[PDB]
Amino acid sequence: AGMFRALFRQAVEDDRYGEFLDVLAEASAFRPQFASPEACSERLDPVLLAGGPTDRAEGRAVLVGCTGTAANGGPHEFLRLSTSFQEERDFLAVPLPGYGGTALLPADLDTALDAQARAILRAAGDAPVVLLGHSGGALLAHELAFRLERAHGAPPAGIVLVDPYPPGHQEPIEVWSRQLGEGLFAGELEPMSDARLLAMGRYARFLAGPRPGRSSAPVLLVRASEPLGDWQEERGDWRAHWDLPHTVADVPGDHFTMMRDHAPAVAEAVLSWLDAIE
Template sequence: MTVSRAARGPHSALDPEWFRRPRPVSEPRLRLVCFPHAGGAASFFRDWPRWLPADVELAAVCYPGREDRIGLPAVEVMDELADRIAEALVPALDRPLAFFGHSMGASVAHEVAMRIERRHGRVLRRLVVSSRSAPSRLRPSGLSRASDEVLVRDVQELGGTFSAALDHPDLRELLLPTIRADYRLIDDYRPAEPSPRIAVPVTALLGDRDPHVGEADMRAWAEVTEGDFGLRVLPGDHFYLLEQAPSLVTELGRLLTSG
């Protein structure tokens, strides 16, 4: 399914098939590119622009296989997904970029950041990774090949905006193939060892009650950067950012535009 011109908003260097701009900015001083979690979609970030500075444009990645791209097959290989997003971002390199990735999206954002830096010499303003173990601490869960019941139970344990939808048989049938494809991408992902260091500074965020990710897992993100690194632990579970979005995004905006 294609996106209408009205939904795309004013002209932008960003590919409208891959990126959604909830509040288009004609001359942004910075673009914040947000990468959703497994099973997640660009709409997860639709409210964030209200808490960002007016001259910061948010662009949420729309992975194939969901929302208005639901007719497309989900990408199940990390290298393919990161390559395609990095290519789609090339026209947007006229402005400073920062990335925010939540859960699976943190790994995708990191892989795209490495490609942008290696291929184009562009260093992001910052890479913000949320609720996802660093590359050196990732271990396959095997859930992508588990039964539907086991997979659904894991998704619902993590919470999030769509976990309750999986209680409804029709919605489960619609959503589960894409969720399973994302879990397969996660299970089969093998980061380079050791992970190449990038110049971009990294900020790691974690909920203090996350059932799958601990402080040590997040602190290890320091290994991927030659820039500065910071870790912040916030109240909440894997989706801590749902309840804390106003204060979190406001602080993130200040961080990205300071200096």
């Protein structure tokens, strides 16, 4: 119903997705923000979408889902996936500050990361943590991992990057900008208000900036095996990418479906990798 949503839907139809994201990023600068993690206007209390075994709880790594940037998204993007972890691993999902307008936006990415970090650290206690993220959420998972390591002196035991397209390897995202945009108008996990579209724009901007910090935690790179649209392989690889991953796993489905009807395949790869890492 909001004007930003109408403008955006029109932009996607006109193949100007990227161009409009810049507008959202520019517009978000006028939204009230929180400059310190304490000022965050929301309880980032991680939701335990899945509970692990009751017998062995000492030392086993817990999974923490890092909510992505989708304006129509939320922590439940991990619901389907978490199913496979019931009785296997504790699966927590942490909201992304500034979403679900009365929610203050983070002044910068680091502030949002510290807010999540504190919520995660208290929720995990002394159990090893393995961050997991999808698409934009994958980039955030890594950024958060490095933040925990460098700024909080608490590095996660590992990072699960599901279909990440980091700076320098985003030609596919550009070529498939339309299907990605249309993906934001399919359904919604939370009402996709103009406020949320602004949050997404701000985070898209944050994630485009230079972030030299590289986490020392091992990485499991999970990749979709079905292309989202036509690609012409002469351009190079359309698949997700990450430097020096510890393990790589190709799964059924495309960028979206890999986390839906094919989520069990992702969970399987993650469960095998966790056993290998521990």
